[PDB]
């Protein structure tokens, strides 16, 4: 039906129908009389998978023959979401599959909804890794994603009595048709033991062994016939493990727990032994695989010419001492040569400056679990500090600040300092964040080695985040400027010539309206709730965290409610305020924020004086598949973190691409988005980084704001007195106490400017033509935020490889 | 090449090659350049599996339409072995697959050796269940096997320093291509809780829930296009299970442990809670499935007309109170009606009279785990004892003996008594065993309800145990009498007309000689040991147990050694004595017996005076796939259990079919084998049951035999003094002490007759023509021991269904 979804040729459709029926019969062992919709989904997924495998084999064969430099992207998280539609988009099969299924009496959209998200990440960091894989394949890079195949991904969120409850995400229950187990490339990983010093070096002995079994998933590029690999490791006990008899078999679970569950924290370091085991597990298995592939092309001087290892935050930082262990202890390279190879091979991306997010492992843990790695870390530290002392003689405090070993009650290893010492490139993820790294937390390292420090502003894939989730928008764009923009997003600039075009204005608004109707209906069906689709859709979706300031949004919502109640017969622009996201299970304040949001909804949504002027909805179980539905429906994107706290953001970019305007602080990538679109086309408010710093020097006193702003005082009195919790009047006292006395994120300091800026949003929404013209100016300038741009910069400036848009033969 | 393996038509071969390459490419995601032999095995298995699925769907469809009476065979064990060859045999595909693989440059026999045994049983009981499934499919019965999908089957046995070591049997590591997961038919199973009595009956509440997920495996009949189902249940935790967060997810293993591992005991009741959970798990899931299928054909009067449930020993005995629970508590039938339905539905097969093998569960366990079932058991008992009291008034001791509840230190439920009370048929597994049941342990029950008690002599499938494992023998038989004997084994009687046929005599001996050469070579390759293939192959393979008397065999072997050493220059018929089998991990005496056998080997095999006259080999890791290799190579089958202890045996039958002569006691099915072949064609020795009873009344005194038999005294002195363990002279004192003072199985009492009978074996082996003529008389009369005969008797005399040799259409 729509051009960007490709051709539905008679031959293709016939062949797809044949293969669908073949899989239903032979693969699934069903006939049409007892097949369920889930069987039909699987028969389609196997049909589409067959089209990948030829390209997958040929791509991997091509890399063996050409022997290009290989890029290894190491991450503890790959937030992939669903695969079926993305595969169809990238193979140009969507219209053919639609037609084929339609002729079989089936609705393909319904089958798509059956697939489970691969929820192997927490939020932005995990999703960035997924976008990056898509871009590396699209740009023809010989790239491999390496991670852990968690049995349970990010928990499913249920809301019960307004509180978050967690349920296990048993995503593999019905099988995963996309992966291929490769038990033949199973590798041993060692833990515990002790170090023996012999005549010819150190030996790590008496270890416990866990096997790492790989599962491979194909990663198709956009219409270029390249299919790369994501290799995820699963933990298995050896067969002699603990080998009365019955108990020894049941105790195999202790080893296999390593890959059981994703730690559900976003921007918070928990410090548990199981997490450290996960980190080493992924690193040790991956590095053996890398070395095997290198040897099957003595001479490790060429290793950095054939291998790049990108560390996604510090989570895989043990790659640095593990590489040194292998080169020194097993290959018998001298230390200095090994270190040169290591530094030239590794590069580190930092994703946060929040102190509670930084990994600082207790020395006693490393000593017990990884005794050889601790020795190597100490030697790295001594040699590194010797360089510092030579460059800054007498500066004893600098030595203490830069040490990999932190002194204190418990000695800890600072993993970020290890990553900087052992990498040839260190980057932040947006311009403001990379500057903050050089001025504050890594200032000392920047002064020693300025050449290491770079910026690589984040991006998102326009395949998933435009073509897949918003085909109506993709199509009206394609009608004007063709299809090349899908792999060259800078071509969206051509849309600025259609800012005064009456037909284009109408089409952009029509597509938004359709997306809003479709989402309003989705809400009714799956969650028994009614919304006005003519209201402004005001959306804040992201993990729940104090720094992201869902609480600031809550204060605005209550302000609007109180204004309506004060002057009920005055016109206000109707809004549907939607907030969604998961709280980490142990993060009490985040769980209280969720409860506050639902409690505000319980009052606002049932007040007959409000009517359909204001609705507050908590969107349950926010995840990649839900993002694909809500983002195309949004009018206003809330990006309201305290300046200096959101390293980049990527949700922000998804909203910009899909025709929402942004209300935001000058934080993370918001700064660059505003620069690209023009500040006049963005709703900027609040303290800049420098203003936050000035307040911190003086002392933040929240009481001053309470005393000066009557509207704010009223809200705090309502919270304290039980207005939003009549049966439990003190339910929110922890929230009030934090806001008044211990608010690290200065919610009150941005309240007045936020409310005023929100009034400007409402004023523009009253003039649909001008709202839509501003939207066009945003979409048109979103090209910089393609992850294709991001990856091309990594490739050229860090990895030393050239991207290619050349197609492999089919 | 050979006729019984079917046709290799050009069209068939071409199609198999095409599909093999299709699976290698699309299913396995390999090309020929990186494929391993394991990949080739999987590509073949998927190719053969495709030929099953059409017949499988059609068979199950046919049962839905015709609605025949369904037979449910409940077992905790299904000892299946490998599937690939058996599937080819039953579909007549073996020669075509051989030719197809040969044209691809591959050796099919090598690929077959890659497949793991499905080792989901311990020995005879589990293997009987597997033979039965094959016969039920071959006889066109609408039959379902129901069990547990253990993650770890019977342990792999390694011998280290002559001792058994156990290793986990991780049989699913590389995947199982034969099964199909059916997560859509997942069912809840309840544990713990308590009983509430309401106005309208008992309710079982506050239970813990475990999910039972079914996996289905096809069971093809012999060339009749029938494919039945074996449904095995796997334990899964619900997603809200224990739902800090991380620990709750890791604790899901506690529920999933139910299906983790097979208890490795043969003829020994251990009494562990986990085993009871396994028993209930299989019963509760299976009964829900049965009832669902019955309702999808109010009125449970027709239930026994549409359903038969066969209990494989007492392991699934909880089916009786579970059926009552469902009918009374959930369907609201009155007790008497429910009991009538239950009794008419259930039948019980007993497999042992050894007292330590009988299940007697402590009441406190049932009270905690299954409180409603315990109440139902007590009510069954009271009503049953009321009938006993009315039939035998005043006989208070009979009431105590027959009670389902045993008094004592700990009260126990006798599960055999429950099975008799709640079944319309009770059978033993060989004539002598069924008679023993009526005279001894179930005498009281027989007097109350004589009509319940039957015999069904065991059997083996001639598909696996002749055609598959011994194609050379199958072929030379087929050349004379055609192929119909493979599904009608009584036709082997026609071979008696070829007992004086010189060509047939020569061919029978030639096939044995070929099998011996092939096995001698297998031993060299896989286990670095050399044997004389002209020696008599004297084989005892079965689980290690005192009752099976591997020790009696050991005494004969030492006797032969001592005779050689006494008169080294006298001719003796050369022998290779092979003993193999697993010991249960906690059965200390069984483990000592293994060590004795290897220690005898260490002395005998290295004595230069013995030469190649005598070799003693312990066959490591005895299992179904090893049975298929060693049994066709055997000359002498050792079946030497103390009279009254081996309920039937089935190894005995496998040897008879494959051209070995038998040395044995009049125990189990040996009695019927000797009756069929003629006692003159069997090497019978030792005490009969009545002689054992006479010795028990007088008192067995082993010292008397030691005092009277100099050859026996010498052996005991050798064991005691360290002749077979020079570095640890007292290593075998537990064995000596048991034989001299606490031998329940009267080894010494049968020693003299055993040695004399063995001398008669040697004398016959010296005359190859007469040995082979006796062999022909055994093979010719083995027809009774087809499991097809056994199943036809169950079908007619217990289940009330008619077997059919009619083919479904292809
Ligand atoms: O489990 C942990 O220990 C953990 C998880 C995520 C993070 C994390 N740190 N930063 C992020 C997000 O990364 C994305 C992608 O760069 C940025 O857009 C966000 O600004 C940042 O918060 N996530 C830190 C620690
Ligand atoms: O795990 C247990 O608790 C268990 C296992 C097997 C047995 C068992 N009882 N009898 C058998 C064997 O059954 C076969 C098949 O009928 C007979 O041929 C053997 O004689 C018998 O020992 N096995 C008892 C208990
Ligand atoms: O000996 C070979 N001949 C041809 N191709 C090979 C050989 N070894 C590896 N390859 C290719 O590389 C393999 C995948 O690379 P790996 O990820 O290093 O195992 C296969 O996909 C092959 O296409
Ligand atoms: O509604 C129906 N129409 C046709 N066949 C059915 C229907 N329901 C069940 N069946 C058959 O029975 C099913 C298997 O039986 P089950 O083991 O009871 O699920 C399928 O194999 C079908 O062939
Ligand atoms: C993009 C995305 C995020 C990151 O959003 P931010 O607003 O940048 O934190 C988190 N979760 C999901 C499911 C996403 O798709
Ligand atoms: C047949 C068989 C048995 C039973 O043999 P018995 O000699 O009757 O105990 C045990 N194990 C395996 C592997 C078998 O094939």
CATH architecture of the largest domain in chain A: 3-Layer(aba) Sandwich
Query: Which protein chains make the most extensive interface, counting residues with beta carbons within 8 Å of the other chain's beta carbons?
Result: A-B, 51 and 51 residues
Number of helices of chain A: 33
Q: Please give the largest β-sheet of chain A.
A: 10 strands, mixed
CATH class of the largest domain in chain A equals: Alpha Beta
Helical proportion of chain A, percent range: 40-55%
* Overall 3D shape of chain A: globular
Spatial extent as radius of gyration of chain A: 27 Å
In terms of quaternary structure, the protein is: homodimer
Strand-residue proportion of chain A: 5-15%
Task: Assign the CATH superfamily of the largest domain in chain A.
Answer: Glycogen Phosphorylase B
The small molecules bound here are:
ligand B0W, inosinic acid, pyridoxal-5'-phosphate
* Total domain units of chain A: 2
List the helices and strands and how they pair.
The structure is a homodimer of 810-residue chains.
Chain A: H1 10-27, H2 37-66, E1 70-74, E2 78-81, H3 84-91, H4 94-103, H5 108-112, E3 118-120, H6 124-138, E4 143-148, E5 156-160, E6 163-167, E7 180-181, E8 187-191, E9 194-198, E10 201-205, E11 208-220, E12 227-236, H7 245-250, H8 253-256, H9 273-295, H10 303-306, E13 307-312, H11 319-330, H12 335-345, E14 346-349, E15 360-362, H13 363-369, H14 371-391, H15 396-402, E16 405-406, E17 412-414, H16 415-421, E18 425-428, H17 431-439, H18 443-448, E19 453-455, H19 462-468, H20 471-481, H21 502-527, E20 536-541, H22 550-566, E21 575-580, H23 588-604, E22 614-619, H24 624-630, E23 636-639, H25 651-657, E24 661-664, H26 670-677, E25 683-684, H27 689-698, H28 702-708, H29 710-721, H30 733-741, H31 751-765, H32 768-780, H33 787-799
Parallel strand pairs in A: 1-4, 1-13, 4-12, 13-14, 14-18, 18-19, 20-21, 20-23, 21-22, 23-24, 24-25
Antiparallel strand pairs in A: 2-3, 5-6, 7-11, 8-11, 9-10, 11-12, 15-17, 16-17
The structure holds the ligand O=C(O)c1ccc(-c2nnc([C@@H]3O[C@H](CO)[C@@H](O)[C@H](O)[C@H]3O)[nH]2)cc1 (2 copies), inosinic acid (2 copies) and pyridoxal-5'-phosphate (PLP) (2 copies).
């Amino acid at each position: 039906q729509i051009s960007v979804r490709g051709l539905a040729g008679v031959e293709n459709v016939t062949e797809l129908k044949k293969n669908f029926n073949r899989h239903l019969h032979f693969t699934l062992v069903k006939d049409r009389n007892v097949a369920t919709p889930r069987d039909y989904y699987f028969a389609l997924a196997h049909t589409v998978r067959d089209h990948l495998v030829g390209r997958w084999i040929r791509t991997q064969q091509h890399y063996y023959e050409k022997d290009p430099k290989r890029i290894y992207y190491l991450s503890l998280e790959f937030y992939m979401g669903r695969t079926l539609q993305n595969t169809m988009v990238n193979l140009a099969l969507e219209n053919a599959c639609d037609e084929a299924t339609y002729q079989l009496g089936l609705d393909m959209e319904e089958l798509e909804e059956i697939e489970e998200d691969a929820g192997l990440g927490n939020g932005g960091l995990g999703r960035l890794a997924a976008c990056f894989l898509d871009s590396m394949a699209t740009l023809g890079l010989a790239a491999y994603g390496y991670g852990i195949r968690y049995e349970f991904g990010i928990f499913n969120q249920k809301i019960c009595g307004g509180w978050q409850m967690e349920e296990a995400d048993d995503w593999l229950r019905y099988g995963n048709p996309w992966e291929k187990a490769r038990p033949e490339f199973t590798l041993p990983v060692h833990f515990y033991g002790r170090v023996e010093h012999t005549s010819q070096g150190a030996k790590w002995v008496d270890t416990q062994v866990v096997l790492a079994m790989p599962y491979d998933t194909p990663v198709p590029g956009y219409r270029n016939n390249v299919v790369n690999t994501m290799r995820l490791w699963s933990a298995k006990a050896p067969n002699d493990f603990n080998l009365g008899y019955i108990q020894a078999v049941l105790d195999r679970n202790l080893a296999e727990n390593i890959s059981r569950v994703l730690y559900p924290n976003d921007n918070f370091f928990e410090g548990k032994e199981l997490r450290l085991k996960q980190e080493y597990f992924v690193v040790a298995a991956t590095l053996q695989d890398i070395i095997r592939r290198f040897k099957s092309s003595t001479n490790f001087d060429a290793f950095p010419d054939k291998v790049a290892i990108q560390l996604n935050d510090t989570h895989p930082s043990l790659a640095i001492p593990e590489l040194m262990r292998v080169l020194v202890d097993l290959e018998r390279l001298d230390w200095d040569k090994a270190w040169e190879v290591t530094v030239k091979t590794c590069a580190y991306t930092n994703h946060t400056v929040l102190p509670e997010a930084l990994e600082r492992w207790p020395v006693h843990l490393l000593e017990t679990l990884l005794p050889r790695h601790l020795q190597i870390i100490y030697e790295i530290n001594q040699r590194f500090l010797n360089r510092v002392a030579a460059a800054f003689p007498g500066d004893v405090d600098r030595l203490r600040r830069m040490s990999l070993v932190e002194e204190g009650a418990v000695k800890r290893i600072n993993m970020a300092h290890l990553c900087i010492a052992g990498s040839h490139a260190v980057n932040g993820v947006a311009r403001i964040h990379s500057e903050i790294l050089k001025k504050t937390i890594f200032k000392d390292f920047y002064e020693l080695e300025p050449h290491k420090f770079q910026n690589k502003t984040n991006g998102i894939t326009p395949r998933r985040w435009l073509v897949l989730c918003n085909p109506g928008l993709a199509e009206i764009i394609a009608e004007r400027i063709g299809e090349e923009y899908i792999s060259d997003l800078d071509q969206l600039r051509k849309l600025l010539s259609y800012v005064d075009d009456e037909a284009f204005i109408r089409d952009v608004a029509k597509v938004k309206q359709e997306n809003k109707l479709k989402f309003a209906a989705y809400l009714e069906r799956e969650y028994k709730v009614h919304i006005n689709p003519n209201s402004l859709f005001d959306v804040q979706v992201k993990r729940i965290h104090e720094y992201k300031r869902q609480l600031l949004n809550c204060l605005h919502v209550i302000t609007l409610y109180n204004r309506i109640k004060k002057e009920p017969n005055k016109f206000v622009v109707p809004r549907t305020v939607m907030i969604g996201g998961k709280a980490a299970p142990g993060y009490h304040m985040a769980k209280m924020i969720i409860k506050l949001i639902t409690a505000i909804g319980d009052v606002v949504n049932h007040d007959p004086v409000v009517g359909d002027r204001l609705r507050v909805i908590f969107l349950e179980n926010y995840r990649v598949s839900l993002a694909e539905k809500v983002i195309p429906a949004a009018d206003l994107s809330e990006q309201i973190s305290t300046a200096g706290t959101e390293a980049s953001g990527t949700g922000n970019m998804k909203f910009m691409l899909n025709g929402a305007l942004t209300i935001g602080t000058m934080d993370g990538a918001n700064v660059e988005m505003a620069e690209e679109a023009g500040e006049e086309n963005f709703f900027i408010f609040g303290m800049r980084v420098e203003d936050v710093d000035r307040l911190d020097q003086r002392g933040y006193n929240a009481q001053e704001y309470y005393d000066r702003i009557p509207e704010l005082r009223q809200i705090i009195e309502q919270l304290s007195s039980g207005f939003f919790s009549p049966k439990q009047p003190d339910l929110f006292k922890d929230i009030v106490n934090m806001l008044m006395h211990h608010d690290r994120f200065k919610v009150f300091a941005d309240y007045e400017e936020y409310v005023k800026c929100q009034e400007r949003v409402s004023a523009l929404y009253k003039n649909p033509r001008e709202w839509t013209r501003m939207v066009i100016r945003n979409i048109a300038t979103s090209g910089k935020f393609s992850s294709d741009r991001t990856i091309a910069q990594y490739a050229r400036e860090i990895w030393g490889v050239e991207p290619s848009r050349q197609r492999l033969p089919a």
